[PDB]
Design a protein around this nucleic acid. Structure first.
Lengths: 123, 51, 118, 155
RNA sequence: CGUGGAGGUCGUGACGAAGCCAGACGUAAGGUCGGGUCGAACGGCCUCUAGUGCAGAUCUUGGUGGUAGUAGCAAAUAUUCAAAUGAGAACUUUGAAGACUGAAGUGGGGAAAGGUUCCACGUCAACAGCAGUUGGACGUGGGUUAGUCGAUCCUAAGAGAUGGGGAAGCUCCGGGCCUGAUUUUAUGCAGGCCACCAUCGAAAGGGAAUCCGGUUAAGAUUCCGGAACCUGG
RNA sequence: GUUUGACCUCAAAUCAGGUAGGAGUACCGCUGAACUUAAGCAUAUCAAUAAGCGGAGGAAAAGAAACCAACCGGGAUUGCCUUAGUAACGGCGAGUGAAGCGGCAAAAGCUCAUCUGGUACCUUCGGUGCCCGAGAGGGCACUUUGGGGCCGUUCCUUGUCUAUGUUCCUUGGAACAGGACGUCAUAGAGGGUGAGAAUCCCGUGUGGCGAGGAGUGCGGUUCUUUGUAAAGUGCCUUCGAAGAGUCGAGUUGUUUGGGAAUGCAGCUCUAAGUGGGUGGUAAAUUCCAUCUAAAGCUAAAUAUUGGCGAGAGACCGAUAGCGAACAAGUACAGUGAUGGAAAGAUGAAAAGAACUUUGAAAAGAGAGUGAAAAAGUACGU
């Protein structure tokens, strides 16, 4: 396809196979969620991996408009759980609802030592 | 004695019986994908533990 | 806890004492059997028991390598160097040795390489 | 096994095919017959200055197709983009797009990078023109913009 | 004429393909749309190409009807009767009463083989050509304890290591042992013998030594309580 | 007559040091079929195939002419191209089947006929210190006459970044729609995302930037030994390091296009020494024209129904494509060798069916969730 040269990639057949099954890291590239605008200006990136201590807003779902701390990201099938972003079973216990990170935008972050150093590097 | 006494053989036939056991509930539950019918299952009258 | 870095800073006496505590502590985890639990310490103790054995093996290799640098030695260090029979076959080594001497010299001569050279 | 799956070309056939194809951009009725939208001219082709190699961006490229009313042809590929059926959708064929402008350049260096971004554009040099450029789908009479140095080289 | 795909051209689409009833024709290959289903994709034209059109080939594979509620579930004549339990009892279990098995058409203990079937408990979807509370299904734990049993050891019909020689080759036939100065630790110097050589091969050849009873849910000449004995160095 | 110490030949031990056996898919050296073809068949064909065996490498194998030749010139060796269905073979039936050349890929010419081990010393592909065992010629005018280290760049590996709408109305469960408005593109390839997205996200782009590495050659810098002998040019005579059961012959094979004339095996026999071999039957001559076997090495270019990484595509799309889209060489059959399937799909979100009536249990009822349950679990249609 494009920048067609002697290189590794193009390639829908591979791309799907690659991104879906994913090693832990392509789930890292997947860990990235678009930043809110205040963060985009300082740090100088559109999206970076989102954190547990961070606060995140939901854009996509019915869930939209809600904010909470991110409880976990489950790496292996790439999804994020947000705190209070739950769905309810019949029994009436509430367990979290998985989110794709594309769906969310990251409102606030915890800077971190390496991650701040690399963020500065990205800038 | 008996049977079949050879120490090495005995272990293999014993080892195999445990290996042919049912699954743990959990793998169905954290789950991969699979209507999980083990398959390896080896059987009372039928089949043969292997020649 | 145990980190690899802490074990290195410890002595040959001290790590041995660790391996002794580790076996005792693993032994108590045997006793605590009736439950289930007890393990988030055994999986990690298994890793610890491996780290302490590795770190000692590594200390002995290094010490050996220092003592022997002075003398002559090396079936054991030889095995790391080749990393067997093929990479060994690729040696002796053959390369500088092969043209170590005849008829090259005549052939040529270089004021010439310099003179041109810019 | 085996099938060639290479057709040889006759030089004489091929030259005739290229030249007729270029010529098809000259008669307007044939361009209109192909399925080209085109007006302001349809005096045809457009010859543009040798200064067009020195077009860096895209803002100039879209703008430039506007003056000769030719931007309309750009609109035609911007929408109307067919979501193909088939196995090609697995490959990369998912969209097939319509073929609009051709810009042909004189310079040895390579095609005008800027002009390449337009939807359904193709860009070429006169040295490396082919039948396909002038007539995609073998239906002749594609809209082209020829640089003046391109025009002399065409000959 | 129709098919899957390519490119270009004309477009079409969140209710598309696809489906079944129908509706309109084209002799005709097919064609177009509608019901009402469906919840994402599809035509036309030109040009091309090809895993390009089927009723069939004791054609392939899957699925399905009739055959059928049909054959079989029949030769030891073996249960019957209270009762136990269970949601449920002709076939689980208790008793009574009755037969039958007899060198084992159904005793005891093992060899091969099986490979946990054993024992306990709790389930009954699937199994047992029928029920089924049951079982040898299923699931879940548990059980096999050797100086004195037997393997190990030996050698047998020969698998045959094993010169040399064919065959490229695969393949195939035909010194080791014992010491004396020292010294009791075994170090240590030094000397002396002798024929046809390995291992493996029988868990039933041959062979060093163990019985008595007691105990377990499930072991037992093993464990144990008593008593005995052997083998080696 | 007789022994003892020592010299070298054969043997056995011993520990040290050094290497091999086996393996990976195919590629890559020998021995060696058949059905099949000729409408039979026996030469021929299948076929120098398959197989079997041996064995190597990342390519292997071949190589600087005792060549080519039919002239007058070429000048190592593979491969590619074509020579050519030509020559040649052959029931001269069927079939079989080149080479020289021409020119390409890529190029390269040389080399035979103090060494090692021990211990010590260091900056350990080395050398020093010791001990131990074993193309050639003359004399003259000259000119040409080294390696090592360092950095940067060459090539491989790896990481990081990094454009532009998520606006309005309407429909919808959802806008990735329409219409309306607007923006980038050196990025209008492709993916994801609740629908059909250059501008949401991944990425993307002629893309930039940082680090790490063997090995080499280009450039720059830096260390330093004497020399001697080699080599060019020109004079003089001259000439060996040049390989024997070989060259060649018969008689017996098999192979080949190879034909009195391919190549190889076997038995037998068997030269010369600048003499000799070749020049497509064999024999006198001068000579022509060419070359020195019986020895060796060697980069690069070619193969790889692919082990290892990646791209691609009018391929296929779940009875298709691999046998295998998932637990597949699994499940399973066979004493063994070996053979060998069926096997994908809820939904935007698990929201994956509370609570109740009824039941032995299995289940049904109502009811709840969702745009939709004839979307309720081998669940799209």
């Amino acid at each position: 396809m494009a920048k067609q040269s002697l290189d590794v990639s193009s390639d829908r057949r591979k791309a799907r196979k690659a991104y879906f099954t994913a090693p832990s890291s392509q789930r890292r590239v997947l860990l990235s969620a678009p930043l809110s605008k205040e963060l985009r200006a300082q740090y100088g990136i559109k999206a970076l991996p989102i954190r547990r201590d961070d606060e995140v807003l939901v854009v996509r779902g019915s869930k939209k408009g809600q904010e909470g701390k991110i409880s976990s990201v489950y790496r292996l099938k790439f999804a994020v759980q947000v705190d209070k972003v739950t769905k309810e079973k019949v029994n009436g216990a509430s367990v979290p609802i998985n989110l794709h990170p594309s769906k969310l935008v990251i409102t606030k972050l915890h800077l971190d030592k390496d991650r701040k150093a690399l963020i500065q590097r990205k800038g | 004695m008996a049977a079949q006494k050879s120490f090495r053989i005995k272990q293999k036939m014993a080892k195999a019986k445990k290996q042919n056991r049912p699954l743990p509930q959990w793998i169905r539950l954290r789950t991969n994908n699979t209507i999980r019918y083990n398959a390896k299952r080896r059987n009372w009258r039928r089949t043969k533990m292997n020649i | 806890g145990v980190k690899a870095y802490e074990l290195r800073t410890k002595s040959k006496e001290q790590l041995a004492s660790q391996l002794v505590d580790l076996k005792k502590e693993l032994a108590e985890l045997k006793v605590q059997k009736l439950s289930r639990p007890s393990l988030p310490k055994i999986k990690t103790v298994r890793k610890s028991i491996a780290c302490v054995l590795t770190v000692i093996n590594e200390q002995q290799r290094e010490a050996v390598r220092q003592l022997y640098k002075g003398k002559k030695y090396q079936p054991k260090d030889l095995r790391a160097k080749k990393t067997r029979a093929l990479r060994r076959a690729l040696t002796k080594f053959e390369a500088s040795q092969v043209t170590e001497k005849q008829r090259k010299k005549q052939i040529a001569f270089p004021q010439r390489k310099y003179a041109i050279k810019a | 096994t085996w099938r060639k799956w290479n057709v040889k070309v006759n030089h004489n056939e091929k030259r005739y095919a290229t030249a007729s194809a270029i010529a098809a951009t000259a008669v307007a009725s044939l361009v209109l017959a192909r399925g080209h939208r085109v007006e302001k001219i349809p005096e045809i082709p457009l010859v543009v200055s040798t200064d067009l190699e020195s077009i860096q961006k895209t803002k100039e490229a879209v703008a430039a197709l506007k003056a000769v009313g030719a931007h309309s042809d750009l609109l035609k590929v911007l929408k109307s983009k067919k979501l193909r059926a088939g196995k090609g959708k697995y490959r990369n064929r998912r969209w097939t797009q319509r073929r609009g402008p051709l810009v042909v350049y004189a310079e040895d260096n390579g095609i005008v990078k800027a002009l390449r971004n337009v939807p359904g554009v193709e860009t070429a040099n006169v040295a490396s023109l082919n039948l396909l450029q002038l007539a995609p789908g073998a239906h002749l009479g594609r809209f082209v913009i020829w640089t003046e140095a391109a025009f002399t080289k065409l000959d």
